[PDB]
Assembly symmetry: D3
Homo-oligomer: 120 residues x 6
């Protein structure tokens, strides 16, 4: 159970989002071992009047929010962060200074999945 929400400038995000989704899924499969069937991504292509970022970021700026169960080690979480940075760099040439990632951890019992609370 991992949800990704990806935000970026529409003009830049729309051309890459289909391959970006594949890349982020690969990266979760590899580092966290989710099932390949369980891709849950949402994209928010933003109008330029709706997205403010500092002058040392380009229009390629991506914010990647990952919502996930509590319980993974700090080391796994850090590896996930570095792997996403490396893979988006490799695939698209977007600088690490233009990528931001935030992990939101949720206790299992706070998540309803397939009709039941996540801890059941």
């Amino acid at each position: 159970m991992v949800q990704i929400k990806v935000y970026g400038l529409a003009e830049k995000l729309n051309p890459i989002k289909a391959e970006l989704s594949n890349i982020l899924h690969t990266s979760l499969i590899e580092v966290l071992q989710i099932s390949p069937e369980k891709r849950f991504h949402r994209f928010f292509p933003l109008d330029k009047l709706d997205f403010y970022y500092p002058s040392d970021r380009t229009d390629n700026y991506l914010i990647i929010e990952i919502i996930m169960f509590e319980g993974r080690s700090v080391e796994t979480k850090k590896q996930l962060l570095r792997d996403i940075f490396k893979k988006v760099d490799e695939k698209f040439g977007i600088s690490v200074y233009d990528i931001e990632i935030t992990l939101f951890e949720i206790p299992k019992q706070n998540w309803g999945i397939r009709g039941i609370p996540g801890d059941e």
Copy 2:
């Protein structure tokens, strides 16, 4: 008691139901959490086909509900909220429980500003 709901789904599916979905979720919250019937705070996010990826074993009725609320309720009450929403949405709209995902985010009251004041006040 302050509760925000955010709901996401494929625009095609969500837009025809959202008015009635809102009523059903709000009733759910009145009955399980005993919130004030006046206090409905909902935001809907209809998504373009190309912006919404859900599992390949599931369908385009995939519906995501995020609820943001004050800390302090029991685990039993929260579990009963999840089971009520799953039940009422399945029955009202014929959306399978495998196509519903619900996530609760609890916020300490001092972290929320409401009507000019922090929530613990």
Copy 3:
């Protein structure tokens, strides 16, 4: 240190003020949290009328401000942040504090990846 702001409101009311509102909110974070004046990260979500339900005692000026930030600040600093935002948006726009809601989401530094590394490094 990293502060991300997400602001929601009715499109008709939010669209004409959002640029200025961005300025005012950033000023408030500079003053209360002493973040770098360079480090403005804001996203706006102007909503269709049909996608936004709020109570009868809010008007159509209702703004929800979600602030995502590193844990580690005191309760008194965070409360001060909430009050400064209420005061500044009210003084600048005449939007009543009853129409303004602020929620703080605190995240451990190590859960945040910035410039290629985890926030605690």
Copy 4:
């Protein structure tokens, strides 16, 4: 479920009453948390005069009660427990509520090993 109580007080005041304080505390948890009446887990820590410093406004009847339990109970319930302990200890022992201090530590279930297994199992 699992509730551990630890009680600390001056030896000369605690030792005469600890058998009965143990019964009072357990009745309170039975009534308020609805734990099984079999499941009493109590430890007492009678302290030497020179090992216990408390404020001058307080008397040598000062008792500290630490309760370790599973996370998952409502704030209303935890507050009912606090109120119940104060009242019953005051009534039974003539110890003033100013001379009683109670702290609760909540532990997630998966962090507690009980009868050979993790608590969430």
Copy 5:
């Protein structure tokens, strides 16, 4: 580099004869599961008088409570693995039923712990 403090509570008459060997067993478990340095043993023992120790009737006088204070950051699986290894090793060495053993993990953010003159996150 990991700080792990263990606090161990049992009936004095039962705990006193075994505490020395129990300290070794518990350390070995932490080294094997958490991979702490073998020179970083921090244990406190609280042998209790009979009248200071109540437990249910389905626990015997061998009842042992092990409180483990440690840094946040380990996975749930590693933590459960620590619980199961402690259960098993204490039973195997001393003949104490796993039913007589209780363990509680207390996780502390690193910045809330001062070690060797500095905050643990430094």
Copy 6:
């Protein structure tokens, strides 16, 4: 606002210093956390040599200071508290900072009962 201190050390070494160490610790809490000078709550646990194991790069002066307090202070203030304790104790007693260990246990105010009522009230 409320702070409890528990101090563990080898009885031979702790007993002769405890009374002055209490003064030194309370001074540090007054100065860094601004607690009331009246509100000293300290428990000492002089341990037998067979009940205290520590590594061979700690001496028999090894002190474990457990501090239980309200949540809500900044990381910067808690770190100052740690630094001040290290300094004052090394200065006053000639114990190396390498022999001093401090652990802060933060508790929601609503998880504490004081003078009959929850700490958030």
